[PDB]
Amino acid sequence: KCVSYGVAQIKAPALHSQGYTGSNVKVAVLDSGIDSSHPDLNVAGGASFVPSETNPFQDNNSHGTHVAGTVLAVAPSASLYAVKVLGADGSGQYSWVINGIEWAIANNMDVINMSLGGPSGSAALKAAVDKAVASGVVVVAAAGNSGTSGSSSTVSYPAKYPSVIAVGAVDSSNQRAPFSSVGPELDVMAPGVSICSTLPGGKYGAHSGTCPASNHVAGAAALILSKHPNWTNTQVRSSLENTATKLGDSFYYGKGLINVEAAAQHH
Ligand SMILES: [Cl-]
Ligand code: NA
Ligand code: NA
């Protein structure tokens, strides 16, 4: 298949070898669904809020299935939930996403991954992610793939909301990917170039984006909570941000590349 490096790059193998693989951590993938038929994917539960696509365990896009593979690669023992808020074409309404956030809160998810976003949000979308973080959920989002706009932030919503961890993409050499959105909202980087993960119908394929980068961070959160089940979302986020491997300027790199090994020992 594609060969990939991302799991090693964030130093997840260190935690796996100590017995920390994300067991009893609930991770909600708010995406195009998850193909649970994939032999490498073990999905704990699901809900679809896409009214024309009723099966959250069928992914007609393939984006949600790629997210799942990357999260389970980082946190093999995580309980993954398929929250379908995006259709086949990869687009959804903000009300579908809000319904998936509400579902994640109600069902005691530890982590939300939103591998999505647009250039504008809404009060109702901000209320939803703010409410999830108030409830103690770790919320992670792709920073966006809008490159640079001189002085302007190009970070998408929901990542642009202070409550949400905003993740940009680096390559295997820790260089910012030219597509990775920029701005003071940027928190951390993770592997986002040619990420090999699961695709529907038992396949594998590489994808580049801030979405695969956010998937590494959602996984890292689950590893941390499988060592520190007592930690608040506040402590989880602070551990990832404060032990990041410093790279370039924060506008481009935030705090740098997540190091889940370091994060799992933060004091
Ligand atoms: Cl369907
Ligand atoms: Na399966
Ligand atoms: Na944010």
Residue numbers in the entry: 2 to 75, 85 to 277
Task: Give the original sentences from the paper that presented this experimental model.
Omniligase-1 is a broadly applicable enzyme for peptide bond formation between an activated acyl donor peptide and a non-protected acyl acceptor peptide. The enzyme is derived from an earlier subtilisin variant called peptiligase by several rounds of protein engineering aimed at increasing synthetic yields and substrate range.
Despite extensive screening of thousands of conditions, Oml-1 itself refused to form crystals. The crystal of Pre-6, that differs from Oml-1 by the single point mutation W189F, was grown in crystal form B, identical to Pre-3, with the same crystallization agent, polyacrylic acid. All conditions giving crystals in this study were employed for crystallization attempts of Oml-1 but without success. This model was used for later studies (see below).
